Ligand binder design. Structure first.
Ligand SMILES: *[C@@H]1O[C@H](CO)[C@@H](O[C@@H]2O[C@H](CO)[C@@H](O[C@@H]3O[C@H](CO)[C@@H](O)[C@H](O)[C@@H]3O)[C@H](O)[C@H]2NC(C)=O)[C@H](O)[C@H]1NC(C)=O
Ligand SMILES: *[C@@H]1O[C@H](CO)[C@@H](O[C@@H]2O[C@H](CO)[C@@H](O[C@@H]3O[C@H](CO)[C@@H](O)[C@H](O)[C@@H]3O)[C@H](O)[C@H]2NC(C)=O)[C@H](O)[C@H]1NC(C)=O
Ligand SMILES: *[C@@H]1O[C@H](CO[C@@H]2O[C@@H](C)[C@@H](O)[C@@H](O)[C@@H]2O)[C@@H](O[C@@H]2O[C@H](CO)[C@@H](O)[C@H](O)[C@H]2NC(C)=O)[C@H](O)[C@H]1NC(C)=O
Ligand SMILES: *[C@@H]1O[C@H](CO)[C@@H](O[C@@H]2O[C@H](CO)[C@@H](O)[C@H](O)[C@H]2NC(C)=O)[C@H](O)[C@H]1NC(C)=O
Ligand SMILES: *[C@@H]1O[C@H](CO)[C@@H](O)[C@H](O)[C@H]1NC(C)=O
Lengths: 312, 226, 75
């Protein structure tokens, strides 16, 4: 996972929706609204910062050459195709496997899914056509077979092992990509990590809203109803109870969001590291890039998150 | 040449810092966040929370204990809630700063005390070393890195046949300026004659794809002739 | 003078067909900036100059020179 949903919650329209008396009462509690709004805006900006750090690591926007002479490897399941949402096949499989009245605005993410797809296509074209060099400076093209020769020679296996077995390695790599395609297309509990984030935030919002229908020890959970049924000399007390209750619920929600956003930022920094060390180059950190000796990796976008294919 | 480039680069850093200051946004942001947290904590003192007056002695005077108790209790509830909110903000922000501090410790242990091979972990490019510099509540690294500059479109081939056997470069790559062939290290064009020492043999011409015929020189033929 | 974005209703900025680096973020990919008599324009941010590497099956690009940059990282 790389980003939550940028949510903002107007304190006032939440606590005291359309009740001037209620707003003027709330003003007595001080700067709680300003504080909560600032916190939720901090989170909502940190999200775009996360996506920026994870994906926008390439200076230019590379593009594969039209021809496909890659020593016998087949990247059509991950390179984009213009026939859609200019995404690729596995990006599609990923995008399909993942599935308002009270100031609950949901801001849009600064990078829209097409631009995320363009970033990942750029990184993928760079890795395919230029090895790691495009992460160290100017991209230098180099025939893919030779690039895998270097990748091998990096793990202590001389090049002739690759060059003599080029066709066998090609077939194994293509078939493995195919098995990934199937594994994703059939079972969906592989994407539990992103779905879990989405569900957690959905349930947090639903609890926040369903707190509106609670009395907290007051007469009726509706504000206008209390303003009508009584007089201000008692509507004040009933309201004050409702305000205390809703304010406590709001702070609890914002604290949940602060913690969950710290955790998502942890996973976003981890993804950024994994992309910088695992795509833009070949790593020698064991099990950091998929179980086994590491050869390379290709990223693929996914709704609020990234998905690597560690070729090992 | 490397000396001059490194000195001039240090100078450019000096200027970049001396002129613009939005490079140090990261530390300034921490300081401002804590300053605003304190200011909100203090300005919460001037709020009534539904009581009579935001001053305590004033409520103790203006009324009797049988009601000063209730007014106070409201003020205490309010100020206590504000204090817990501030301390929770501090707990979270301190966890985040500890994250960045562990990261800085890792970056200093792997990036100063040694040379790393983790890409982009030590500044964009191949990593050469780094020097730390203190800064108020934080550290500032100068990742001295090495960046390849200007390339040439050479023609290559994975191996070469000389006597029916395939020849692969030991540590380098086979390039060709269209006329002859050389083996050169991967990151700095420095062509060499393809001796039987720059390369090592294997298999035959049959199996590799894209091999090209050529003549691998042999240092023993001169002495063996003479 | 009145643009309608996927974020909301932008008022007071021309909607250009161009594309520059994102100066002030807005949302949904739109970014606004103050440029040329000048005014405030709102474009669809560009991700960088596209570039097609002259890939082949027998062409390799090797550097001949190098530059020693010195970057800074603040924590
Ligand atoms: C190293 O392991 C690979 C594993 O893929 C070996 O290649 C595979 O070997 C099996 C067994 O011979 C092949 O299965 C057979 O394929 C033939 C093809 O006509 C078919 O007639 C048989 O019914 C059976 O399916 C498989 O094709 C082959 N895979 C590839 C990509 O060639 C390889 O032989 C092993 N190396 C050594 C030195 O043993
Ligand atoms: C590798 O790149 C470096 C980049 O610094 C090249 O060195 C620089 O080359 C330029 C162009 O000749 C030099 O600029 C000229 O300097 C002379 C010095 O008298 C001056 O008369 C000219 O008006 C102009 O400023 C520059 O000085 C030089 N830098 C250094 C530190 O020597 C280098 O030549 C490149 N290597 C190759 C093989 O091309
Ligand atoms: C690369 O060379 C092989 C063989 O090289 C030949 O024999 C060497 C000892 C030396 O004398 C070279 O100059 C010779 O060219 C070529 O394989 C031959 O291909 C021809 C077709 O043109 C065929 O009639 C022969 O039977 C093949 N085998 C031999 C032993 O000659 C190969 O075609 C050359 N490839 C390239 C790309 O130049
Ligand atoms: C690369 O893999 C793709 C599939 O991922 C291959 O496309 C198949 O091509 C055959 C023959 O043209 C068709 O029968 C299949 O229906 C195609 N499948 C898909 C999903 O398009 C392609 O042939 C492979 N090779 C190359 C060079 O692209
Ligand atoms: C590269 O592709 C061209 C296209 O026809 C072909 O003639 C040549 O033999 C190929 N060489 C290698 C090494 O793949």
């Amino acid at each position: 996972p790389v980003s939550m949903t940028k949510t903002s919650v107007d304190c006032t329209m939440y606590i005291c929706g359309d009740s001037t008396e209620c707003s003027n009462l709330l003003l007595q509690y001080g700067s709680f609204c300003t504080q909560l709004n600032r916190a939720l805006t901090g989170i909502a900006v940190e999200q775009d910062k996360n996506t920026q750090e994870v994906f926008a690591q390439v200076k230019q926007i590379y593009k594969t050459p039209p021809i496909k002479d890659f020593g016998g490897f087949n990247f059509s399941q991950i390179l984009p195709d213009p026939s859609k949402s200019k995404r690729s096949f596995i990006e599609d499989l990923l995008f399909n496997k993942v599935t308002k009245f009270n100031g609950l605005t949901v801001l849009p993410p600064l990078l829209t899914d097409e631009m995320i797809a363009q970033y990942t296509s750029a990184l993928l074209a760079g890795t395919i056509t230029s090895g790691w060099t495009f992460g160290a400076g100017a991209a230098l093209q180099i025939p893919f077979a030779m690039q895998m020769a270097y990748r091998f020679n990096g793990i202590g296996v001389t090049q002739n092992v690759l060059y003599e077995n080029q066709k066998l390695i090609a077939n194994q790599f293509n078939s493995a990509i195919g098995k990934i395609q199937d594994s994703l297309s059939s079972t969906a509990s592989a994407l539990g990590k992103l779905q879990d984030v989405v569900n957690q935030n959905a349930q947090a919002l639903n609890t926040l809203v369903k707190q509106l229908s609670s009395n907290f020890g007051a007469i009726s959970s509706v504000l206008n109803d209390i303003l009508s049924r009584l007089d201000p000399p008692e509507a004040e007390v009933q309201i004050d109870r409702l305000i205390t209750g809703r304010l406590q619920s709001l702070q609890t929600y914002v604290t949940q969001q602060l913690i969950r956003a710290a955790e998502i930022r942890a996973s976003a920094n981890l993804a950024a590291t994994k992309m910088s060390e695992c795509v833009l180059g070949q790593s020698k950190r064991v099990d950091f890039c998929g179980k086994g000796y590491h050869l390379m990796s290709f990223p693929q976008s996914a709704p609020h998150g990234v998905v690597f294919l560690h070729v090992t | 040449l490397i000396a001059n480039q490194f000195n001039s680069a240090i100078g450019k850093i000096q200027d970049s810092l001396s002129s613009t200051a939005s490079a140090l946004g990261k530390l300034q942001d921490v300081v401002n966040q804590n300053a605003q947290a304190l200011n909100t904590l203090v300005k919460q003192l001037s709020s009534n929370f539904g009581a009579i007056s935001s001053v305590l002695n004033d409520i103790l005077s203006r009324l009797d204990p049988p009601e000063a108790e209730v007014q106070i209790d409201r003020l205490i509830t309010g100020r206590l809630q504000s204090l817990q909110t501030y301390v929770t903000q501090q707990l979270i922000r301190a966890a985040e700063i500890r994250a960045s501090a562990n990261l800085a410790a890792t970056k200093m242990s792997e990036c100063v005390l040694g040379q790393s091979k983790r890409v982009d972990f030590c500044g964009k490019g191949y990593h050469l070393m780094s020097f730390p510099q203190s800064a108020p509540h934080g550290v500032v690294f100068l990742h001295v890195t090495y960046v390849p500059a200007q390339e040439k479109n050479f023609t290559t081939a994975p191996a070469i046949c000389h006597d029916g056997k395939a020849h692969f470069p030991r540590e380098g790559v086979f390039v060709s300026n269209g006329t002859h062939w050389f083996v050169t290290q991967r990151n700095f064009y420095e062509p060499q004659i393809i001796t039987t020492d720059n390369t090592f043999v294997s298999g035959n011409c049959d199996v590799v794809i894209g091999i090209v015929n050529n003549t691998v020189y042999d240092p023993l033929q001169p002495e063996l002739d003479s | 003078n009145v643009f309608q974005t996927r974020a909301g209703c932008l008022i007071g900025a021309e909607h250009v067909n161009n594309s520059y680096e994102c100066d002030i973020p807005i949302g949904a990919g739109i970014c606004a900036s103050y440029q040329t008599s000048q005014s405030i324009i709102a474009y669809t941010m560009s991700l960088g100059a596209e570039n097609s590497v002259a890939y082949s099956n027998n062409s390799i690009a090797i550097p001949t020179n190098f530059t020693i940059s010195v970057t800074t990282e603040i924590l």
